[PDB]
# Entry
Amino acid sequence: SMTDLLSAEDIKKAIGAFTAADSFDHKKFFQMVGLKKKSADDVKKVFHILDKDKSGFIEEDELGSILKGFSSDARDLSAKETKTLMAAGDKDGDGKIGVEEFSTLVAES
Ligand SMILES: [Ca+2]
Ligand SMILES: [Ca+2]
# Structure
């Protein structure tokens, strides 16, 4: 569970800071949620939780619902947020975010 990996309190506060549509800043989210104090192995564990269909990649649908991954109470990302995140994250251009790509997003926060 996400709350097994990260602190519910940290999650609450990170979600709480990006309540308005278009306010998402992945670096600051990653920082607040506690993903910057996690080992690479824990990072990968988070990734697997986010990859809803276990395809090994975070596709557009899972990307839009990334916050729901952390707390089912969270909003979906707006269109500009999804577009912006995919663009920061997709280095090989397949339109998806793989494990390494996700790890890099986190590491650069
Ligand atoms: Ca997937
Ligand atoms: Ca990719």
The first helix runs from residue 2 to 5. The chain is about 55% helix and 5% strand. The helical segments are 2-5, 8-16, 26-33, 40-50, 60-64, 66-70, 79-89, 99-107. Residues 1-109 form a domain with the Recoverin; domain 1 fold (CATH 1.10.238.10).
